[PDB]
Design a protein around this ligand. Structure first.
Ligand SMILES: [Cl-]
Length: 211
């Protein structure tokens, strides 16, 4: 029986597409709604194509961050999701909002956290001369930070450019996000006392590693 989620987006929503595809292939997830803070997010079209209700909640149209967040939370909660899943959602969320969803809200980030929070991760890893790079899935707490669930890594080689890395890491995103969602659907994950547990066992701080 599918675990109900709500997905938050700001843009293209490529990870939303990956989840949509995985569901078609049997992933036990129901996307009850997709919510965007931008009317021009292509991800809205991805959702509509899959007959998923979409909500636009333009953050600038609210007197304050808390009003915006209030409408966001009420819109989310209407669907009684078990999990809130960020997919390219770019607004920072306040302390209260993050608390309301503690243990129930996750994000995917195209770096090996805690390195390279923020934008342009691939170019920054290259510029620093990293030999490894990848993607992290974590609970939301601080910019792109929180207890790690899963981290997938790959090698940077001499012919890599920021574009090859972005594309190769995009493949890892499409693999690991739906996989983590499958862990939640199967009741395998817990967040307790600053630690993540998988099948009742503490994960390493870096989360479950691939390869
Ligand atoms: Cl590898």
């Amino acid at each position: 029986e599918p675990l109900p989620i709500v997905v938050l987006i700001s843009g293209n929503g490529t990870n939303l597409q990956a989840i949509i595809g995985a569901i078609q292939k049997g992933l036990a997830i129901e996307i009850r709604a997709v919510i965007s803070n931008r009317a021009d997010a292509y991800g809205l079209k991805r959702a509509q194509q899959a007959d998923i209700p979409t909500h636009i909640i333009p953050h600038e149209e609210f007197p304050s961050r808390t009003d915006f967040e209030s409408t966001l939370q009420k819109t989310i909660d209407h669907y009684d999701p078990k999990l809130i899943v960020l997919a390219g959602f770019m607004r920072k969320l306040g302390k209260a909002f993050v608390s309301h969803y503690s243990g129930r809200m996750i994000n995917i980030h195209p770096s090996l956290l805690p390195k390279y929070t923020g934008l342009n991760t691939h170019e920054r890893a290259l510029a620093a001369g990293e030999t490894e790079h990848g993607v992290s899935v974590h609970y939301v707490t601080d910019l792109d930070a929180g207890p790690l669930i899963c981290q997938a890594r790959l090698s940077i080689t001499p012919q890599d450019t920021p574009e090859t890395l972005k594309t190769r890491v995009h493949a890892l995103e499409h693999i690991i996000y739906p996989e983590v969602l499958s862990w939640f659907a199967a009741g395998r994950l817990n967040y307790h006392n600053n630690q993540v547990f998988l099948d009742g066992k503490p994960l390493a701080k870096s989360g479950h590693a691939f390869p």
